[PDB]
Structure 1
Amino acid sequence: VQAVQHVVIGPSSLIVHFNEVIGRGHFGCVYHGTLLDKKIHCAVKSLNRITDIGEVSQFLTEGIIMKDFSHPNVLSLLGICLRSEGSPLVVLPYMKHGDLRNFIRNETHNPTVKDLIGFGLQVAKGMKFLASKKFVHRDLAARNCMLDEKFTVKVADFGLARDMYDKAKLPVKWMALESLQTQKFTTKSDVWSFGVLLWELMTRGAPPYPDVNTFDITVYLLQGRRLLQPEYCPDPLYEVMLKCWHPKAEMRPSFSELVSRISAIFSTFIGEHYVHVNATYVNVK
């Protein structure tokens, strides 16, 4: 009732545009939306699940939490909409440039080594923020990072917005060695995923490990193998990737140390080096 109020949006304030789908998910669809009080453009996820007395309240809990995760590099919640008609709708700010994987794959764009590391740096700061609240993402990947009108990168795909959106149910190519072996996740397993994220950035969104079977990944990693240095990835940034993929989670750098190190590397690049898609990775599912 009273305390919950800063989250809740009235059904009367929300116009969901059901004709205009943004994204398909296991747990519902995403559509453009219009929020009022003024016309604010938003994205609106419909959740199929809802009917429980508990889980309508429980989706109120993560709503409160998500509202407390405001940081420029983290995707925030506008509100939740509790409709007596059918389902509850998660209302998210609208991200002009959509997801980071598709932004860098788009062959109409010309990012430089500087822009790409800048994006990597922005994710590192969101994750630093998340990690400091003791929150483990479990599914960090370029596709799950958003990019707004000012080129702010927002770490996304957590809380009530959590799904698998890509065209099996575990994203094995981004998962740390120990998560694959024990199914358990920590900040240090997000650091591994983050390393794979920097690789996607430096390859402008190539699928990691194209030659490698999804069920063979553990054996691949235990044989001595890692993602190659991308053509345009600086040495010191590749060194950072390798550190993120240390086999022992304690030895991996913290997100604090990632922001500090990547900053150093960022401060040296000035938009002289244009990044272009590599021949081997181009057009691969």
Structure 2
Amino acid sequence: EIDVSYVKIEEVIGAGEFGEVCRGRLKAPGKKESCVAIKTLTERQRREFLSEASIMGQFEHPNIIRLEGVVTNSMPVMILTEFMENGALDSFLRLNDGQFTVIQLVGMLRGIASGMRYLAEMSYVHRDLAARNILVNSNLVCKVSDFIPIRWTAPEAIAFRKFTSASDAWSYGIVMWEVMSFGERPYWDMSNQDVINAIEQDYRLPPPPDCPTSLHQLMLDCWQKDRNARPRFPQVVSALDKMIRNPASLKIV
């Protein structure tokens, strides 16, 4: 896939499941140099590592992390993607607590919803939609990555392992809550089991401080117990676009 001579690993920036995550530079003949994220790396686990690239490589969308390639004929085995300068959304927001406007936050949520709209249209169920799995670039563009998280997971998917695009819509509501709360943990210190019982007993997360009521209502819609009643991702995007068109709507809190 990618000639190893074309890759320069600069800084180690994080740690992943199978190894490091690094910032680097990719320069191939005919093409300008670009900034890349690089994951570096059991046999079964090697295919486990590389599967992420194969899935990621099925997708082409501005709100889904772009795969540049892999290094496999050489060692260490690598996966290269575009570089997202601002990292994971939950930590980026915690660092920037209170510092982005409602309209900026809605833009981030819209980018995430578009990503999910695309994946649902491709019949791809994510199963692990959470702000930690959303990456942010220098322009604040949010992209879905990562190809049972109890507090993000729909009640039926927990009970039955029924993962659908409608269970993803539940998870997206949780992401909305995370974004509007600037990266607070869903259900704070409640335990997984407490969360499981709380939801079954009709508890839902309250509006975050300063959260427009219309955004909280959209969260409640995403968290309907009847999965068929939840908005599909096209309706989610359209709702968010409506709010962007009509920012007046967002002042009610």
Q: How high is the TM-score relative to the length of structure 1? A: 0.80
Q: Secondary structure at the match of 2:67?
A: coil
- Aligned match of 2:168: 190
Cα 1:62–1:218 shift into 2, 3 Å: closer
Which structure is higher in helix share?
Answer: 2
2:27 aligned residue (19, 31, 36)? 36
Gaps of at least 5 residues in structure 2 are: none
Provide Cα deviations, 1:19-43, integer angstroms capped at 9, x if missing partner.
x322222222211122112432211
- The answer as to whether partners of 1:10 and 1:81 remain within 8 angstroms in 2 is yes
Give the whole-Å Cα distance in 1 for the aligned partners of 2:55 and 2:202: 40
Cα deviation per residue 1:136-185 (whole Å; 9 max; x = unaligned)? 11111111111112221111111xxxxxxxxxxx3211011011112231
1:77 aligns with 2:67: yes
Q: Aligned partners of 2:99 and 2:47: how far apart in 1? A: 45
Q: Secondary structure at the match of 2:8?
A: strand
SS in 1 for 2:193: coil
* Alignment equivalent of 1:15, drawn from 8, 19, 26: 8
Alpha carbons of 1:265 and 1:196: their partners in 2 closer, same or farther (altered >3 Å)? same
1:46 aligns with 2:40: yes
Shift of 1:64: 4.9
Unaligned stretches of 5+ residues in structure 1: 1-7, 159-169, 274-285
Deviates more, 1:231-240 or 1:189-198: 231-240
AA aligned opposite 1:33: G
Match of 1:223 among 185, 190, 201: 201
Contact 1:113 1:269 in 2 (8 A): no
Q: Structure 1 residue runs of 4+, over 6 Å off?
A: none
Which protein, 1 or 2, shows the higher relative CO under an 8 Å CA cutoff with sep ≥ 6? Answer: 1
Residue of structure 2 equivalent to 1:68: 58
Report the Cα distance in structure 1 between the residues aligned to 2:15 and 2:160, rounded to whole angstroms: 30
Letter in 1 for 2:205: L
User: Is the CA contact 2:98–2:182 (under 8 Å) kept in the aligned structure 1?
Assistant: no
Once residues 150 and 141 of structure 1 are traced to their aligned partners in structure 2, the CA distance between those partners, rounded to angstroms, is 20
What amino acid does structure 2 have at the position aligned with 1:204? F
Q: Deviations over 1:245-281 (max 9, x none)?
A: 01121111100110111111222228x98xxxxxxxx
Q: CA RMSD in A?
A: 2.4
1:109–1:199: structure 2 CA closer, same or farther, 3 Å change rule? closer
Would you say how many aligned residue pairs link Structure 1 and Structure 2? 247
Question: Quick one: structure 1 residues 176 and 232, their matched pair in 2 at CA, closer, same or farther if it must change by over 3 Å?
Answer: same
The letter for the 1-side match of 2:15 is R
Take 1:126 and 1:257, find their aligned partners in 2: how far apart are those partners?
Answer: 13
CA contact (8 A) 2:135 2:142 kept: yes
- Seen in structure 2, the aligned counterparts of structure 1 residues 228 and 93 have a Cα distance that, compared at 3 Å, is same
Q: Report sequence identity in percent.
A: 36
Is 1:171 the counterpart of 2:161? The answer is no
